[PDB]
């Protein structure tokens, strides 16, 4: 994967939830994303009340879409998902599997520093 979409949707039932996911993925495919898979984290009560599209929500479903997308169309994706009203919060990040884990080889113990002051007698 290259990009990851943290997609928090409105809490609603199965058929319009699947329909909203359908039009979201066709919106991605219209801008040209090659989507790998879709992930559901379930529906959870939100950490805080989020105001979006003239409404206050407390419960919402968490979904993840990972894809390969050109760098110019991410703004178009964010604009379309901003105008979409069945989503409460879309965000696009670089996927963490792109970077590789550099090695924690251990904590190097730092010496206390020498030679900071002159050898004058106080």
């Amino acid at each position: 994967p290259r990009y990851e979409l943290a997609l928090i949707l409105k809490a609603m039932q199965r058929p319009e939830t699947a329909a909203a996911l359908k039009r979201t993925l066709e919106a991605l495919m219209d801008r040209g994303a090659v989507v790998r898979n879709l992930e559901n984290l379930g529906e959870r009560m939100l950490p805080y009340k989020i105001s979006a599209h003239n409404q206050r929500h407390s419960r919402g479903g968490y979904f993840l879409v990972d894809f390969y997308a050109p760098a110019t169309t991410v703004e178009s994706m964010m604009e379309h998902l901003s105008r979409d009203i069945d989503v409460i919060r879309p965000n696009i990040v670089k996927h963490p599997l792109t970077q590789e884990v550099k090695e924690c080889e251990g904590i190097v113990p730092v010496p206390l520093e020498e030679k900071l002051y002159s050898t004058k007698k106080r």
Partner: protein, 175 residues
């Protein structure tokens, strides 16, 4: 302005065998469409060294360094046509131009034919450094313009006087 195709199949994935038998999905992923700007920069840099360079494996050669710097300057001018108000990148562009000018002078003072080849091919016009860099202010440009115009009028009046004198000489010599 060279135009890489979207199906360029970027630099790191060209020489591996068995590419054209693989379907359109992986070819689309490995093409320049989902690539970054730096992959396109590598593609342009490789094509430009294959276009102008004599022996491509030598990175340490001055002409190859000028090729890489020219790629970087073209990227910086694209960035400046995008963003006008950046000052750090404008500074980077001017020092990049200055280093390219210095290395072009170094190449010119050592090997003239290769320098002429790069100078013709890249479109760069090498301009010689003018002595006595002074700030041209309004009084100086006004006096210089006046002095040039006075010199033109002096030479024009001298040409008219010489033509009238030659006409008078021919007229009295004919009779």
């Amino acid at each position: 302005q060279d135009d890489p195709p979207p199906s360029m199949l970027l630099l790191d994935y060209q020489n591996v065998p068995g590419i054209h038998k693989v379907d359109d999905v992986v070819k689309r992923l490995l093409s320049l469409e989902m690539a970054n700007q730096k992959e396109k920069l590598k593609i342009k840099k490789m094509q430009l060294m294959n276009k102008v360079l004599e022996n491509p494996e030598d990175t340490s050669s001055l002409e190859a360094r000028i090729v890489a710097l020219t790629v970087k300057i073209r990227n910086y001018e694209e960035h400046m046509q995008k963003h006008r108000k950046d000052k750090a990148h404008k500074r980077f562009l001017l020092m990049s131009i200055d280093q390219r000018k210095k290395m072009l002078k170094n190449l010119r003072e050592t090997n003239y034919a290769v320098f002429e080849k790069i100078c013709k091919e890249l479109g760069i016009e090498y301009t010689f450094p003018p002595p006595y860099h002074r700030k041209a202010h309004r009084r100086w440009v006004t006096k210089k313009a006046l002095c040039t115009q006075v010199f033109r009028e002096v030479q024009k009046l001298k040409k008219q006087k010489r033509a009238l004198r030659a006409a008078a000489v021919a007229a009295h010599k004919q009779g």
